[PDB]
Ligand binder design. Structure first.
Ligand SMILES: N[C@@H](CCCC[B-](O)(O)O)C(=O)O
Ligand SMILES: N[C@@H](CCCC[B-](O)(O)O)C(=O)O
Ligand SMILES: N[C@@H](CCCC[B-](O)(O)O)C(=O)O
Ligand SMILES: [Mn+2]
Ligand SMILES: [Mn+2]
Ligand SMILES: [Mn+2]
Ligand SMILES: [Mn+2]
Ligand SMILES: [Mn+2]
Ligand SMILES: [Mn+2]
Lengths: 310, 310, 310
């Protein structure tokens, strides 16, 4: 049980400052002590300085390529995370990456799939995060990682992203909790036949059935490695208020944590990302502690914590 | 795809002013643009002036027949809606009626069943709305439409209601979400063997199963037209605060919208009422926007809007 | 239909004052009138004066045996409840005990099992309440009743508890709603193979299935008497705020009441405890009325109240 907690305090994939404070905040809640208490030998991995990156972000509006914002900054930071995560996985350690906005998954997924080529990817999110370079309206890259990982709209992806290995195939990615998919993204999922389970399926079949379906969808070869990239805005805002893109009608706190227990239970989780925790985007301090403690909660449940004896 | 959005700004079926503001408020949210965006050719149908009706309502306390309040006013306005809706349906257009209190369903159901005689009726409500003329304690007619439509307690129904056609039979009406049924109403449902699915059934079988059961109950002849009269107080107040008769322990925002998607999915919806939205009965502006946007949301989901590609 | 509403205004099993106000508060809500309205012939049973007991509690910090706090006071009061409940059951009346903290279940369960020796026990709680004398960290006895009832850690249980009959066996107790079990308690449940259904099972199988499983687990001999000891902190705090030990991710108001209807429905309920309602631990008066009215609600549903005709 060797784990490396990758610190990825990046906010360049979106507009709002504060999300780079996620890593520090989670660690204050005692994320490492919790992992250690779950029997994991943990080591912290710092990939870059959040203050320096923030500084460079807030100032250079010139970093743009069309609607896309901060491709250069984003490309540089996610390559750093990729190299870190790839190394963490080669050393045989479990990489637990804490963001940071979801654009960091560009480096995490590439890093993990580079070592575990047949690893499936469960994207827990209210969003599909698969907008293409020329398709994105907002230009916020945290909503475009999967398009770049799948190499969609190749011809329009910047040179600064040339580093991204092409290891993820559409049949190895499954979504859970979708409810704010852009029209362009709907067409993409349908055309690539991506296994996507929206809140409709959860409402229709119950979370247990959805998680089972999602795991099977990316684990056909019998039983392969599984990676989970967890966007906290999947959870209904009334549970996760402090986030950049909240959408009502999401997972309940119970379903959000139950999903983790089911994944833990299958015993094939090889990596985990917990992203989009933005402490600054909270009304009261109640909103902050509820969101950050949720991040640590999914971490604990994903890493084996159960309600009863085990 | 021809639709007529029937505006029924009536509040005479209950005490609290404000519910007549529903139609306007929904339209401000962009109800028509949403329907148009769903591919519907929409036309607005104004049945009467809400200010004039309100004025006449707030002043004439003399309009009563026992406990029943405003039978004359109610009878005149609902006959107007009936004529409008009956015409809308004869023209082959889908009538989407926005209230207004639930007493308007006296005109909508009569209008629709007049054209689609074998149409089933799904009453989504926390209440049975079937109190008889001599049985009602409050005398508020928005809780008596189904008794008049089924012609119960004939001998005690006013002359001003002589216009109501007898087209709805007990075996063609199904309730979903019941939780505040009056004792008299419990006896009625049991005696007439009305298919009623309370929050107990939803809690017991899950919303998907209940909707399936409700649709089948009124669609025995194989597959007949279906009409839905949707009272927003079916949804738990913590989701729909701005309503006249809130009862805790109701449908979640997710179940409230999932039910719409399932009905849409069956492809036999022929009419829809969205009632009891009272903007004035809101604490903050957060309560208002949450309720009105919910009304538009059920409209969109009922009319085909899905989370994924379709 | 003969019922005795046992008043047990005790708070010695925990630190916070106010929980002894539960009985009075529930009765103000009209608990007795509700039971009478459900057809029960009710009689109130006062076991001791809450003001006198409170007075004696708040002053004597000397009443301790290790970490355990107020064993003498607790032992004296619960023996009183035991004698009352045992008598109520011998008279052939249904004992409905209103607390008071959960330490009162020491007297209720012993009283009921003394008359109905093969009675099963459903413990609805977020906690296992089975910490041993030498195992409890907090020393609060409201979290140790089941250890004393099962006679665990005999050698370390005070003399003042010598009165407790040994009538409850591990295979006749089932938990529902667990989510804050101490490590020592996890080991105990696992070693004694106690049927425990946590929020994981509710999330996994749905409340209906859990209640069915829980009833069967203690009713093997075909169909024996069933007793329910209901801790209101089983319900998610956002529904039951005014309680001493709230834990997020609990039962919804709907599941909390549905469980009661299912138990009522089986027709074998022989006793009921509604505990841990602490009116003083409420932010607004909204928190108070929501919690106390919940207590009366579970009472009504447990005693036969249904949403539809019955
Ligand atoms: N689809 C929107 C929102 C994406 C939100 C990104 B995420 O899932 O990481 O929060 C956009 O492209 O701007
Ligand atoms: N049953 C109550 C309340 C009826 C509520 C009407 B409705 O469902 O339209 O809100 C009454 O008769 O006054
Ligand atoms: N397990 C904790 C909390 C027990 C809570 C008791 B109860 O369930 O009655 O609220 C303790 O031993 O102090
Ligand atoms: Mn995301
Ligand atoms: Mn998202
Ligand atoms: Mn209604
Ligand atoms: Mn209603
Ligand atoms: Mn308890
Ligand atoms: Mn408890």
């Amino acid at each position: 049980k060797k784990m490396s907690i990758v610190l990825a305090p990046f906010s360049g994939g979106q507009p709002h400052s504060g999300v780079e404070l996620g890593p520090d905040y989670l660690l204050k809640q005692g994320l490492q002590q919790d992992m250690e208490k779950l029997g994991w030998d943990t080591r912290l991995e710092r990939v870059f300085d959040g203050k320096v990156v923030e500084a460079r972000k807030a100032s250079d509006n010139g970093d743009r390529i069309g609607r896309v914002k901060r491709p250069r900054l984003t490309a540089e930071c996610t390559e750093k995370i990729y190299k870190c995560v790839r190394r963490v996985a080669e050393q045989g350690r479990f990489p637990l990456t804490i963001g940071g906005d979801h654009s960091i998954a560009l480096g995490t997924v590439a890093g993990v799939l580079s070592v575990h080529p047949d690893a499936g990817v469960i994207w827990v999110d209210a969003h599909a995060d698969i907008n293409t370079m020329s398709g994105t309206v907002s230009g916020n890259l945290h909503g475009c990682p999967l398009s770049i990982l799948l190499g969609l709209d190749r011809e329009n992806i910047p040179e600064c992203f040339s580093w991204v290995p092409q290891v993820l195939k559409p049949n190895k990615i499954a979504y859970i909790g979708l409810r704010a998919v852009d029209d362009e993204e709907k067409k993409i999922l349908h055309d690539l036949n991506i296994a996507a389970f929206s809140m409709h399926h959860v409402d229709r079949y119950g979370i247990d059935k959805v998680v089972s379906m999602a795991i099977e969808a990316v684990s056909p070869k019998g039983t392969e490695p599984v990676m989970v990239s967890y966007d906290v805005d999947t959870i209904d805002p009334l549970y996760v208020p402090a986030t950049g893109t909240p959408v009502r009608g999401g997972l309940s706190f119970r379903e959000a944590l139950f999903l983790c227990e089911r994944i833990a239970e299958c015993g094939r989780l090889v990596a985990l990302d917990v992203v989009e925790c933005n402490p600054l985007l909270a009304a009261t301090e109640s909103h902050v502690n509820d969101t950050i403690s949720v991040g640590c909660a999914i971490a604990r449940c994903m890493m084996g914590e159960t309600l009863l004896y085990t």
